[PDB]
Design a binder for these strands. Structure first.
Lengths: 338, 95, 348, 95, 339, 339
DNA sequence: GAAGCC
DNA sequence: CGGAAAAGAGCC
DNA sequence: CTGTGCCGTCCGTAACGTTGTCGATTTTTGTATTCCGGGGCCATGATGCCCCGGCCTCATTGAAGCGGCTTC
DNA sequence: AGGACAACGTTACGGACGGCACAGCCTTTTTGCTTCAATGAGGCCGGGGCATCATGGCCCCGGAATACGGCTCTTTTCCG
């Protein structure tokens, strides 16, 4: 069902009948319809009666606990036998190298198609045409031609490395349609360990936020986000965020560092090259996270079926579809290239 | 490794008082009209003088910790002419 | 091999059995308020868990602070029938629970553990007999014709062909043992201490002690589940106890050895200390139930049992049952890695 | 055989206050806005709770002695977030 | 027990505040002593004291004495009874036999001339051929040690001890501050002169008088009187028997305070007004000096015979106790405490 | 010098001008006591006597003492010197030569008996039948006198004084308000018991005990040890000199105080609550007995050698001076004060 | 000469 | 000097 | 001129009745692998200085024994 | 608790000072001489512990330090 979100950190959730009706001040405001529902996203200080909750726990409906902004606090796992089926399947297919590689290939072809989805639009560095060099476009198409058959999780790594360097050496070509003063991406790191650049102060921050929702809309279902098929975990790597965020690694935390400077909000007059690439103004941080929520609430459609929703509802139904693919109903994983 | 530490504080400003009251009350129980008590180990007493030692000014505010014995022999080394002396008990709060 | 770190532990659990409680964060203490009248307050340094024994309201400010300190709230139905639990996006290690899931999918591991997992419960059921068998005349010690048959059941279990035959043996030595249980209490059941062990396993208890058993068991369950989320294991992938809603499929499997040491050694102080007089009970409405007069006493008994210092056989060092639960979880992990081939079991 | 004993008194009535103030001030020096300190042996602490324990009511008055260490190792087991902590010195008052 | 109460500021006004004595110096308090923690009370002459505090102090029987401006000690209270007339009679009848008087004198000399040169040779500060005990002064001062065995009678006693102390006297300004200080000189001819001539004989005179009181208090504690002197014939200026039993401790404490006063540098010549008695000590050093005497008398040293470690004030009290035991007669010889 | 004086005022001021002392009272001038004819001075209450004044006083060894708000003697301060030690050594040497001790003791019991039957004659209150004491009574008391004057040894004086006291106590119930008053009883043998039994016994014992204190202060102001005398020989803290100096002044003051207390008909046995042993005076009764003791002092009786017809403390320190001078000064002997 | 007094 | 791999870039 | 006795008369102690309401962290993460390093602790002498006590001396009051003469 | 907390908003109680303003006082009876009862007073040490003070040999976390495998596109002396 649709995952309810206790939105206003003023509300009051309760169970009247078979619907978790929420309440503003002594006023009914929404009907939950327990028959078709999922997690209730609890925001800053919006409360629920300890009678609805002792129903959610009964019907294996995870109850989330987010701070006022959306910052994640721990979950409320129902001790049933529905979620641990999902964790069982995740850790069972986890070490099955065949399906592991199959997932990996689907993920990387999705990411490549999504990154190559920045043709004609975004990259506006026109001069003569923003339309990306058909050499580059067809090189990405050939890279997908490769990736739809890559017989290891180390051939895939080299393929992804090549076809990320190539198009991280084309960034500025889609930054301002050129160089906005200060915003010209040094064709360099995506800022792995320390920041080294302005865009390398935005393309690791924005990614750092993308990790959050791909960890939480994964722990929004019985999926252990720390066991990933693609990335072999190293004691603290949300390896099922990283096996999972790939087709949204360009889709979200790139189209939000872009429009934060494509629309010209962010200028070198908002960050300081302080012992690293940059560190934003707290106001710059706030407007950036704002634009992040613009994208996160930017709309999309058709997860597997015609259904037009914000990026969070898709960003969770993706995990649901994953579980359904894991020995469940769906026999082949839907992958969602736009 | 745990002792009983009595905090004998006397500040000067309510804007610092209320904070110190609630904070160090979060450590141990009310004991006397200006003095509380706590039963703590090394790490939590460190976090006491962490949480305390900046809620207060260091000129117009006086606070004073008192490291007593290991809190099970505290009874011999303290007596209360008024009400009783009761070290706080490490007990499951079954209420 | 040879675990060197137990967890010292700063706090100790808070329980809320009152079904009309209300819990507010106040500064750093955690005040509970009752019909706008306070009762108690926990210093959040001194809180190690939280349990809500029934419909006892909570305020989300407390959840945010508690997870902001990561102290596991554990929602619980009236009979301590473990229902809910809070988790913060998984333990931040993967190697431990991947070892868990991996070995679980191995069927041999389950059997090897179900055996040492069921032999370690019988071989302390019988010593509890040979410790709590209240003989009066021609009875001062339990009959060796029984203390053999429990041993006879032990040799039936160390040779289990499967993982359902072993459960059958568990049930076979949970009927004989409970037939002989009624001898344990007040020199024989007194004022309506009717251990109708036929009603064993019945969902709402029919009898007084069964309504105390199915509570001491059903809160040892929670205690193991908390101690099995500390080493970072996943207390839901059960080697032979399949997941049952309300039953952490492995917390029901690493308690089986401590079902007699910690549960049937607190029932046999609650009853053997006048903490259950059949007039202490909600005599009906659940088959039978318990009255909060004795509930706040039995929880105290259980907890003080959980704070008893005993030696661990491998190093003879003395530790509370809680810290011992976590040391034994540690041994489960470092056998799960295959580090230690066998599994030191803590029989007594 | 001598320790340092801190008296943490907080009583209600000035007709008892003034007397307690002056009396137990006769034992040791002013320390904090309600708490004094003294350095005493067995006989003189006995005479303390002799002189004290009847100046006060035993219902509406609370007083609390604090038997610390032998008054030469008092410095480790007490710290003062505000001013300094100074055990009273047994010194000839050459003034 | 209690601690001493010295009152040296010329304009002190001591007035009782319950069991705390709060002194006053022109309408402002200076310091407070807990009356239980008060051992004794000494006043310099001009500093006054309210009568309520006084006749409460004797109500607490803490002894009282007055120094002069420089400590002549004409003022010292009597507690109207020690309640041991037996010791009184002992020491009177024993002073009325000159054998005991003279033999106690000679053991005082041995007590101050049988280990005195060893206390100055263990801390001598020279510059050349004087660092260690002078070889020509060791045997020269040893002649008096061998001549201090059989003391003839009072007259000769009074001479040589001083003249032999004269040999000590000359050698006083040979360790202090590595030779004469920045205006400090012990003219050994200026010792025992009513006007304080040298800047140092002022300090030595004050030390000698206040240690004289420090011995009078021990005499009072065991009922002895400083009135009846063996060879210190009772002179109106000074307590007789107090001198009679402080003389061995003149070097070890009374000279020690001046020695440690000059050598440790707290004594500076820029602390005097002179030409009145030849030289006179002002504040900022007398307050330092008498407290300097105070530190020395509180630290602890073993008793040679009783083998336990005791404080110098308690040591003096035990010395008087040993006098009483000698009156009993278990000790043919007085324990003279040679270091 | 001259006869001493005493001061009272609670907020007075004692200061010195050149050669005299004026006892100012809140900046109010009084007569200038000339130091050439004055002696020891007492201080009552929270007076103010400057320290310099007592320095200048103790220069000449003129004594001083500290009292209560009224006259409850507690404390003293004394300087050293040569006269003071001379007096102490003279007393203790006269505490060794017994012929002088007996020269005083014989006359002491004789004068006690003389003042005793003098008191019988004066305080004869047997009106109605015997306006006079029996001539046999006074004749037998004078026989006791001639018995007591037979003392070439340190002996029988005890027993003869005991017999004299016994007979006087037999008639001392006649010394009551007119007869053997019920509730005013008197038993001759049971006098001076460790507890009192009769109110009369309590008054007599308390009167002697209080008189001993003025005797010992008269001893203490002069430089004579109060602890050494042989009528009650010195043993474990006696007022032994005072105990040897108290008997003839029992009829003069103490017995006279009891007589004027019980005859005058003011104090009633309602204040004489029954104790286990004896009717001890309550607060009011004790205070009135003290008042009678005081009123026994001020009336003027002189001795022919020193024509001081003033009071009895002017007559209570005169014998202290007489004893001091018989030890040291020019007075030929110690008179008896037989009225 | 004996025992109470003192 | 046209090749051609080897280096080093990029990125994983 | 020292309690002490209320008469004041400020602080700076805690209770409780008001509207705040705030705040969320942070800018990777590609396989492995062996240090690097302090969190940190049962375990183990080790020494400390908290008194366990206890027979060594002092003392200070009256149990206890008792001066002589007159009268019964 | 409908945001259920935190900060603040003014007035119960204390605590100490200091401001003046009165008083203003106090104390048992035992004296005949040993010896001691003996209960109060400390003072040296026997070995009865003992809170940290070192390891310290482990347990590891939990990042970081290299230290490489990988894929395509480009780029210093060199082989043929």
């Amino acid at each position: 069902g649709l995952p309810l979100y206790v939105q206003s950190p003023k509300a009051y959730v309760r169970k009247d009948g078979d619907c978790l009706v929420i309440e503003e001040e002594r006023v009914r405001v929404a009907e939950a319809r327990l028959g078709e529902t999922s997690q209730v996203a609890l925001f800053g200080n919006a409360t629920l009666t300890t009678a609805a909750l002792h129903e959610c726990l009964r019907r294996e409906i995870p109850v989330t606990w987010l701070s006022y902004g959306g910052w994640f606090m721990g979950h409320t796992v129902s001790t049933g036998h529905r979620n641990v089926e999902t964790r069982t399947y995740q850790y069972q297919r986890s070490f099955d190298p065949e399906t592991c590689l199959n997932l990996a290939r689907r993920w990387i072809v999705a990411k490549i198609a999504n990154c190559r989805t920045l043709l004609r639009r975004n990259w506006r560095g026109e001069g003569d045409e923003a339309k990306a060099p058909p050499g580059l476009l067809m090189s990405l198409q050939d890279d997908m031609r490769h990736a739809m058959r890559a017989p290891s999780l180390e051939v895939l790594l080299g393929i992804e490395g090549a076809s990320a360097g190539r198009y991280f050496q084309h960034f500025s070509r889609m930054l301002r349609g050129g160089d906005g003063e200060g915003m010209g991406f040094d064709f360099t790191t995506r800022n792995r360990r320390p920041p080294k650049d302005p865009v390398n102060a935005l393309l690791s921050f924005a990614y750092a936020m993308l990790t959050r929702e791909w960890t939480v809309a994964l722990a929004a279902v019985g999926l252990d986000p720390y066991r990933g098929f693609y990335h072999q975990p190293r004691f603290g790597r949300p390896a099922l965020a990283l096996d999972m965020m790939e087709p949204f690694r360009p889709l979200i935390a790139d189209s939000t560092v872009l429009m934060a400077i494509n629309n010209g909000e962010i200028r070198t007059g908002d960050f300081v090259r302080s012992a690293g690439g940059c560190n934003l103004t707290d106001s710059a941080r706030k407007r950036f996270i704002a634009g992040f929520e613009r994208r996160m609430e930017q709309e999309v459609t058709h997860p597997i079926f015609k259904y037009t929703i914000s990026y969070r509802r898709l960003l969770e139904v993706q995990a649901r579809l994953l579980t359904r693919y894991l020995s469940g109903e769906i026999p082949a994983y839907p992958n969602f290239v736009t | 490794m745990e002792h009983l530490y009595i905090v004998s504080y006397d500040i000067r400003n309510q804007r610092r008082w209320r904070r110190l009251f609630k904070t160090m009350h979060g450590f141990g129980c009310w004991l006397q009209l200006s003095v509380f008590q706590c039963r703590l180990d090394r790490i939590r007493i460190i976090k006491m003088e962490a949480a305390i030692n900046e809620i207060v000014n260091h000129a117009e505010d006086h606070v004073l910790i008192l490291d007593l014995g290991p809190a099970e022999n505290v009874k011999p080394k303290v007596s209360s002419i008024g009400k009783t002396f009761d070290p706080i008990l490490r007990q499951a709060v079954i209420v």
